[PDB]
Amino acid sequence: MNTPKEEFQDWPIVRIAAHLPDLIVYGHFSPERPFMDYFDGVLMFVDISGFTAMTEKFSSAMYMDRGAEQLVEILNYHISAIVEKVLIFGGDILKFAGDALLALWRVERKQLKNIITVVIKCSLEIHGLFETQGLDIRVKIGLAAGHISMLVFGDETHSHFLVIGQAVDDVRLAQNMAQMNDVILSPNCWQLCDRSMIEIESVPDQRAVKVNFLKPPPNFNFDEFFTKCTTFMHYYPSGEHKNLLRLACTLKPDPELEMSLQKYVMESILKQIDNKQLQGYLSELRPVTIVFVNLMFEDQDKAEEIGPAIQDAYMHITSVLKIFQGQINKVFMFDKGCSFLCVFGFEKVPDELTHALECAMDIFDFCSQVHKIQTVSIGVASGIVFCGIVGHTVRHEYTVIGQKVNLAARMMMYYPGIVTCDSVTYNGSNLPPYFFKELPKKVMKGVADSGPLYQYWGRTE
Amino acid sequence: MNTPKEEFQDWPIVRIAAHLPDLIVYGHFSPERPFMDYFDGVLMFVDISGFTAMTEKFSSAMYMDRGAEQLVEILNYHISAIVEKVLIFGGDILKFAGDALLALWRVERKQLKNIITVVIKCSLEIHGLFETQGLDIRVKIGLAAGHISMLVFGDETHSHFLVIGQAVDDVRLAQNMAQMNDVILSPNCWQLCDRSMIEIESVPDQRAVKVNFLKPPPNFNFDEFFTKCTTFMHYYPSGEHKNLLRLACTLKPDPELEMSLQKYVMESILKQIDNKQLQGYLSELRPVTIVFVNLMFEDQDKAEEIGPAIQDAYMHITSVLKIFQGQINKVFMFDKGCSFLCVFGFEKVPDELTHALECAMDIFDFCSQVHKIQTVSIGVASGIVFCGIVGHTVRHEYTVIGQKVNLAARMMMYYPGIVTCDSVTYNGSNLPPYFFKELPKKVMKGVADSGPLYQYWGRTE
Amino acid sequence: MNTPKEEFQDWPIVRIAAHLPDLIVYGHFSPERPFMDYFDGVLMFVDISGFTAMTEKFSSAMYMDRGAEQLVEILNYHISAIVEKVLIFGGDILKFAGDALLALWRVERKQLKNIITVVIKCSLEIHGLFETQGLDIRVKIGLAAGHISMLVFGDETHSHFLVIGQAVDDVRLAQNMAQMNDVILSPNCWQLCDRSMIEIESVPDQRAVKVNFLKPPPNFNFDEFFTKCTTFMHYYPSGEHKNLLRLACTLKPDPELEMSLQKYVMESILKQIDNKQLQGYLSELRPVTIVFVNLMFEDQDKAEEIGPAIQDAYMHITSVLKIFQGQINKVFMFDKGCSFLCVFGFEKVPDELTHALECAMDIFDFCSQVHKIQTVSIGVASGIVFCGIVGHTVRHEYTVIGQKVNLAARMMMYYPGIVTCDSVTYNGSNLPPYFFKELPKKVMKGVADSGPLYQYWGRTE
Ligand SMILES: Nc1ncnc2c1ncn2[C@@H]1O[C@H](COP(=O)(O)CP(=O)(O)OP(=O)(O)O)[C@@H](O)[C@H]1O
Ligand SMILES: Nc1ncnc2c1ncn2[C@@H]1O[C@H](COP(=O)(O)CP(=O)(O)OP(=O)(O)O)[C@@H](O)[C@H]1O
Ligand SMILES: Nc1ncnc2c1ncn2[C@@H]1O[C@H](COP(=O)(O)CP(=O)(O)OP(=O)(O)O)[C@@H](O)[C@H]1O
Ligand SMILES: [Ca+2]
Ligand SMILES: [Ca+2]
Numbered sequence A, B, C: 001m002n003t004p005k006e007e008f009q010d011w012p013i014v015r016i017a018a019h020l021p022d023l024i025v026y027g028h029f030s031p032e033r034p035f036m037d038y039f040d041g042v043l044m045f046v047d048i049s050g051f052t053a054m055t056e057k058f059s060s061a062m063y064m065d066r067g068a069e070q071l072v073e074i075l076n077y078h079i080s081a082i083v084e085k086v087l088i089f090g091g092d093i094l095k096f097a098g099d100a101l102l103a104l105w106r107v108e109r110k111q112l113k114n115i116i117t118v119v120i121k122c123s124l125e126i127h128g129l130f131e132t133q134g135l136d137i138r139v140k141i142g143l144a145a146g147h148i149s150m151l152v153f154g155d156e157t158h159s160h161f162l163v164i165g166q167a168v169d170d171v172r173l174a175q176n177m178a179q180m181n182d183v184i185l186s187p188n189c190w191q192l193c194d195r196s197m198i199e200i201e202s203v204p205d206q207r208a209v210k211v212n213f214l215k216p217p218p219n220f221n222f223d224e225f226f227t228k229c230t231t232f233m234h235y236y237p238s239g240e241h242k243n244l245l246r247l248a249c250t251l252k253p254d255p256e257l258e259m260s261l262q263k264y265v266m267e268s269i270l271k272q273i274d275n276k277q278l279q280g281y282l283s284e285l286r287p288v289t290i291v292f293v294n295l296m297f298e299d300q301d302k303a304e305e306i307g308p309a310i311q312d313a314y315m316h317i318t319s320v321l322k323i324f325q326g327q328i329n330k331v332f333m334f335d336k337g338c339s340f341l342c343v344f345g346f347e348k349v350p351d352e353l354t355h356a357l358e359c360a361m362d363i364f365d366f367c368s369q370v371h372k373i374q375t376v377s378i379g380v381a382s383g384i385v386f387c388g389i390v391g392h393t394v395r396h397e398y399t400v401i402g403q404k405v406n407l408a409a410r411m412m413m414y415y416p417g418i419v420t421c422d423s424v425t426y427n428g429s430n431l432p433p434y435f436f437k438e439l440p441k442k443v444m445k446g447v448a449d450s451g452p453l454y455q456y457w458g459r460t461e
């Protein structure tokens, strides 16, 4: 008989699986909402700098109305290489935060010390890519190890996951401390790490530490040491499938599973995956209204406490967003609180600025009175941001990039406890100035020019 | 010099060839209509059960308006494996009858006895796939060997082929006798088969027999025995091309040939093949009106007798269908008669129920008075049926699946000599009840609930 | 660690690079317009005959409205084989002139003699393809070696390149002399070629010569001799990439470069490359209005003289074309002059014939008064011509084919110094006959039936 070659079949379930991590794909858990699960592991948070400035530049006339297609191409080219090195070293890319991403190495408690050596060596090879030579892009890496807690929340047709814990805080703080082209270990990490191998220098006014270089023992063989660590890695491609990047590529049609997975991904993306829409139309530089919500609590690391609150918060957010036409792009822990990245005009309608401000007030009013929510903080920005699918062929997500996305993210941090909006949203909308308040100009990190920032006061006095 | 790798070129003629068997692709014959050709061979009729119930289930709310895409995926996943095993064992998939399919091993008279061993071993490996574990699907296989007669009919822009003979009757009867997960040999088969190898048990009130297992001679080598049989197989991939499933994959641009082949395939499919339409839009769960015609004769096996009649019948069918907006999905011998599967709203228009009943009457009136047509039987059903491309990448066809397709197929059998319509067609249309007659409720095989079935009586009394 | 296979990534810059030669892709030069660059090399001009007759045939009823898709398929099938043999022998396909194409082997002065042996052996293998057996197609090859001069001209959003020199004239004249299935060397070639190897017969009333066959020295090894010549070839795939046809396939995202390259390609093609348009819709048999401009000079080979003139000519052409809706398909040296192939209704509008004639007059009036332009000659033809992407997957261009394209090309040659239009353009438009003049019927090469040809006289007397 003939033994014909079996072509890699590109099933919808395999296409959908590219938008999610192995954490979710092979994570079988109760459909009850919320849901929590606890485990240990190492977290890597890679952040690329200079792309929002590049995104701003690509809207200019010189790219001849191909700025969105020029941006995805160069953006994905560099991120694909990063994603490969994460996947090849046994990592799981959890989430794509615009030009930044969050990776995870999930392991049992005792095997952290060994994994951090793998994650550190991985992070150095990632940094090694962009020391060579896409002329002004830098990269920041923060590493943290310890207890992590997944939270899965949502309704019957949608689902959203996010990670919680001291490690999730540590990794972000570590990355904020990071200078241009540096690797920062949290205080719990480095303590967990094998201290004989890793050389470091102390950060000023900080208990975290910077990695200079690995100084491995004499007869050390990283190829052998890696193979030991792969024993504890669950879904690392092996045997016949060792040539693959992800085990998710080998998935087979399973209606039950696909129904579960499709809830996490947007309808626009599913239409494209189902071949009922062209691939290029999701990549675009369009005028949107960013609405960056941020919910803070008394104890941010307590999964059983904040889990129910975020579920209650989501159910209201998604409902009021649906009335005005908004959509939740991403949900993730952003500096001591869960943050919903909402977008209007993704759903293009006039009076979008008038809707966005009213919904921010609507969300603020409900979220303030939900139990255990200590502080609600919302930021609103409007302008030309990039929208599109960012990542590798086997691991990518739909995300938004731009200076207005940065702006809205800072506004909720720098102006907490209140709803805030930029100059474009203020003037574009036309409620009287009694509806707003002019705020003092604060100098903000990671943003060029705020202009006059305002606080949406409300309809009544 | 450099010797670069030659990428498999996906020409339109190769794409079109996937919708047809090798019987038609490499069958060069006169363009006169009708056309008959006579030969010997073994027929396998594989039928999957439980998918119309699954199709009904996939229209529910839990699949979140991705039931059509969920269905094709799981359906094709299982059928692809079946198609592979047919193609790898040297078979030719003639036709896809919804979730069922018809295969053919064409050989000279004396080599039947050897081929049936190959077809039986093939059928056992096909049954072997679904004994393991898509939780409630069963499969039925019927096998028949003997004289077969092809009939090619149609007009100048369209063509339709179908097989005729005692073997074509035997194989269907064999499959109807088959219990869940069984292999049934016709009485002519088993007599043709090597009786020393095959063990069987007798079917009650039947001259056909069930296959239990192969009991091959002591020093038998199926790999060697297969290679002998491949000598008599014309188009079995070999040499440089042995890695391919079909020889049709190696086809090269030939306007003459492509003009001949494109007539067999629908315009909707050609538009998709020509890349003037997205792939996903043909896969859909849509409300249609099935019109299942069935023409019976005095001698069903006589190709020279019924061939001209079916040609005359087609020419009227296609003309009156074009007036109302119908389309012939499939034509094939279904239990002692040639049966046209027609579909309305494939061509979406209001008053589609009013058109379907009038055309059934129109077809009935003409077909009754065409010479040699003993009995005309038409069944009409309306509801949500699945439409889409079913099969393997190299061998697939556009077909329809659903409980309403089953219903219309039974109605013409159980209520012969008259036009019949279901409750949905009766009430949806609004001719007075004088135009219809209420029929007695018969218990029908392969259908859940008929409801009140009616007979379309006519305009006049 | 795992070392996964790296799938050929199909970046937009790689897709765009297929529409251009290595001359342009790896040619880094000043953005000033015009730009000239001088070098030596061998030119091959392959021309296929009988396809415009085939194109005319494919518009008939027998192809069932798939003539455009049938034509591209068979056309590209034969041209792909030609393109491969050019690329494999180290050539660079400069331009696709409908069913004809222009190749280039760029080398230093002293290595011509060796390259011509490679080009001749290449041309014989190209001719060898179509001596076997797409029933009435012939091929003509002309070869010329010597000094070549590139000219790059255009505006800020578009660019156009073309080659100038005695070699560029020689190669066209050589091809015009060529009988059906012949290889013609120019007088400078053959003198450059190794005369011991190549056997020839003299052409009547001509200093050019026909190639009969190569008669290589005793212990000659073409595989070894080729490898010597590849030392002087810049971009010939080698090492890890020797399995590729073009080095351009290995291109990596470079915004600067991609901005430069995208100007050469049409917006319609970029939309398709960006996946915002289906591939099939550019392939079509549509009614157009061809406007074939031809600018002649005192010294056609002088790059510094005619370069500025063509730049000045282009800037007016593109502007007046944009008013009426025209588009420049191709620009190239056609028999002693630079020729712009313009097309209307590519931009479908009524009164397209009324626009085309006025623009021809507009272009004629300006171009006549531009310095150094000795003779302006314009031809206008209207009818069903083929439009689509012609070539290989790695090297293809958007071009137009048809008898009306031939007609407009002859009209400007046979009726120089004036604007001319065919019978279809005359009668379809409705300016009074005072606006036109009836011309005498000249017998023209490469066209079937002119009908009454007219001269667009003008609005005033
Ligand atoms: N798509 C997205 N997902 C998550 N966070 C985002 C985001 N877009 C912007 N932000 C937020 O905006 C803030 C900006 O971070 P910074 O590090 O100061 C900018 P950068 O990374 O140095 O260069 P960039 O502006 O090119 O991104 C971060 O706190 C980040 O969380
Ligand atoms: N697309 C199609 N092509 C040909 N015949 C069809 C068809 N859809 C339904 N039928 C007819 O409907 C009848 C139903 O056959 P059965 O075997 O009783 C149903 P089954 O195969 O057991 O499970 P199913 O209902 O999931 O198909 C058959 O006689 C068949 O010919
Ligand atoms: N797309 C295109 N690009 C460049 N020139 C074209 C063209 N279409 C037609 N022509 C011109 O039309 C003329 C016709 O050339 P001929 O050689 O006489 C026709 P042929 O090649 O023998 O068969 P054909 O008519 O199938 O092409 C040439 O001078 C050519 O330059
Ligand atoms: Ca960032
Ligand atoms: Ca069935």
Ligand SMILES: [Ca+2]
Pocket: C047, C048, C049, C098, C099, C100
């Ligand atoms: Ca030609």
Ligand SMILES: [Cl-]
Pocket: A095, A161, A162, A163, A331, A332, A333
């Ligand atoms: Cl998260």
Ligand SMILES: [Cl-]
Pocket: B095, B161, B162, B163, B331, B332, B333
């Ligand atoms: Cl049939």
Ligand SMILES: [Cl-]
Pocket: C095, C161, C162, C163, C331, C332, C333
């Ligand atoms: Cl040119």
